[PDB]
């Protein structure tokens, strides 16, 4: 049925500048919000301003030294932290820009507030598109991410929920979140990703966990050019089996949009409808769900995808015609909500997918 | 090659101050052909990867579990013995190599191997 | 006994090599030294004999720091784990502490030319260019709003208190960086003096900063309007070409893939694979065809015949008698072979040229069917989308371009045929033809990019099919044998006429004893026609 959801947006998130020519652009969130305003989706949704997360909240998973470095480093004093900058992997790939700590605070606070809201049972759906940074490690920055807010949100969720299930449909492997919970059975991480000469280079079929957390981490490696039909054919049965064996109490869904066709860094061939089919499938199971952002580097497609999933989570149907908005010219020349795929070859043959699915099923049957 | 970036960055500027198992060159299945060990099909259906220890060609999908990407280095086919040696991962490769070379000088041994096979084969031990 | 000798005989015969066989012998010898248990022995021998159930059953009867995964390493035990201040009980009991993964690559890698077309990079560059200007503009506008709000607050209080009002480094906003960033961008090196003036004496300094910011905002807005005008008709020129990932590859790949030698190799390789399988003795019946293709519509057949006739009727080097002969071959004999004039089959014995012609004709028919199906799908999707979007309350459930009418959507396919005819005549340029096809069929248009050449190829075959006595003798032999009914007939009567069919094949062998002989079976089923070709 129709249910109450919480939305987290801070007006200042769109202004933070990663640098010239850097694929990561917070501006996308702003455009997404703008689209939500011009479809009239603010009336059926509750919008909150996320509180900034204190460094004490972040040190629940990150070391105090790394957080102190993040809070201290500025573009005008890069000379006095060079060694530290080498140590914490802050530099070329993850640059130091103006107000990066405030960006991390807002992104983390949105997801932490959503997790607290879900714990208090004041809602069964919280959305934070500023979140979804899953590559950050305990004491280092990786993959354009500085603070791992997914781990902090799950740590907040664990205070009331015995089992938390995390699902990752970003094209990259969520190594930070999987590594944070590699040896525990209270969190199982499902990741669908491209594998083979690709960042971060982890997430093999045989990475199934360690110690007490064995068989509680599943990875589906893929090839170039997966499309909507294959993704739908292999996502629904695997998630159904995971939910029937694991029986979780809360779900955290990472909705990274770099797995769509035409992405500046991705290789897949999904569309907005096929991407949001996963949201529909997850929502079918009626669990406290926390939807997060993530990757996505073709800015217009990110806006389209995230506004469509926000509409889907509200059980609201929106017209295929884009309404007039502040960033309308981004969406030319068609000005449609849905996107068309390319005709790139799908290298994932049916036998490959069947074999990987069978291996995953046999791995899942071993849970107690 | 007219890009607008220069004009925008100037407009916003602060004031500041002063071999044989592959398709031919034109693209053709070479003849005579060599086939996959699992399906007995050539490179036309899919590219073949060649084991560098034994002359066994394989398909990336015909393996179990299938390879996701091309192996960049030296790859080991699933039809060798070093896999059971890999069960114990503590020992290094030099001892494994010396153990293998312990049987690399009398490679035929056909009489003695059939003899050992029948010697074990007896149901009632001697 | 001799059973063991027979077992070893068949295994070294089936392994087809000495090295794999010797690896098997090494396995059994390592077992013989009592280092291998029986179950472990069979699990090691499974790779060698996993595809011969008989051999596997016979062998079973005869028998009667640490590292995990692939990318995780154990942390040192004597490693000073970085202390954390917020660790609660769940933090200690849940968080991983012993295994680490090392990221092997870096994002933004060398992917520029890996898989993207040249027309995606232009779109990416235009998008970036848009983003840089937009982010500067919106930072300026947010700072303008913040200063307007603080000025409105200031104007409402007592004049003796205004000189006592001050601002912090957030400058009235919720961020300590953004407002200073905007002021720095506006003022260059003089930014710190203006910032100190704003913090110390807001009353006199706010309006002048607001005026400067507003003037810069207006100038940047008009510049952005001009840049928006320029950025358009680059998206228009790049979008449809960015989604078509195969045209550049497809043109050359298809211009090669249709040569006679390539078609011959495509079946010779399959014949060699089957011969090797027969040599190894694997369980495969010796009656399956080497290649199988499907025709799914007769209308596509007469459309293709009409296209080929249209091209051939405008040929200067083909004489009127040859035009009539090709007409009889194309509109009479070929439909008879496909039985246009269940379980009813036709048998045909052909040389190289007829095999080439059949391959090319099947390719053309399949492509025409693909285009037709795409047009039908487009029309259906448009109608369904119209019906769906008509019934939409949108948010009540708590310029642009004019899409074509339905009539154009259903007339796309005849328009496509007219376009193919125009291209064949040479009245339309290949570039305009390709652009119209792309705008008509989006990402499935490339299927028709090299049709004319294909038709040309087919024409040549037809012409040669008249000039070579072997081909006319082949068709005459087929007709003479069909007059007896041995070549082709009902499926059940096969065993009734099988010996007679053998005679036909015999004659084929004595008519093309220096040339490849092809057995072609046309099987009709549920409105489709399956053409199965096997090389003798
Ligand atoms: Ca993933
Ligand atoms: Ca786990
Ligand atoms: Zn990603
Ligand atoms: Zn194979
Ligand atoms: Zn090998």
Numbering used by the authors:
A (entry chain B): 8 to 375
B (entry chain C): 17 to 34, 257 to 364
C (entry chain A): 304 to 367, 394 to 670, 737 to 793, 802 to 939
Which passages does the manuscript contain on this structure?
Histone deacetylase complexes remove histone acetylation, thereby repressing transcription and regulating the transcriptional output of each gene. In order to address this, we reconstituted a recombinant version of the human SIN3B complex, composed of the subunits SIN3B isoform 2, HDAC2 (hereafter named HDAC for simplicity), PHF12 and MORF4L1, expressed in the baculovirus/insect cell system. Remarkably, SIN3B encircles the deacetylase and contacts its allosteric basic patch thereby stimulating catalysis. A SIN3B loop inserts into the catalytic tunnel, rearranges to accommodate the acetyl-lysine moiety, and stabilises the substrate for specific deacetylation, which is guided by a substrate receptor subunit.
Moreover, we obtained an additional map of the catalytic SIN3B core subcomplex (SIN3Bcore) at the resolution of 2.8 Å. SIN3Bcore cryo-EM density map at 2.8 Å resolution is shown for relevant sidechains and water molecules. As detailed above, our cryo-EM structure of the SIN3B complex shows that a loop connecting MD and HID domains (Gate loop) inserts into the active site of the enzyme. SIN3B Glu436 enters the active site and its carboxyl group establishes hydrogen bonds with the catalytic HDAC His179, whereas the Cβ and Cγ of Glu436 makes non-polar contacts with HDAC Phe206. The Cβ of the following SIN3B Asp437 makes non-polar contacts with the HDAC hydrophobic Leu272 and Pro30. 16, we could also find an acetate molecule coordinating with the catalytic zinc cation and the catalytic Tyr304. This suggests that our SIN3B apo structure represents a post-hydrolysis state of the deacetylation reaction where the protein substrate has been released and the gate loop has returned to a conformation in which it occludes the active site. Strikingly, in our structure the SIN3B HID domain binds directly the allosteric basic patch of HDAC, preventing InsP binding. This interaction is dominated by a triad of SIN3B acidic residues coming from the stalk region of the HID i.e., Glu456, Asp457 and Glu461. Specifically, Glu456 and Asp457 interact with HDAC Lys32 and Arg271 via a network of hydrogen bonds involving water molecules.
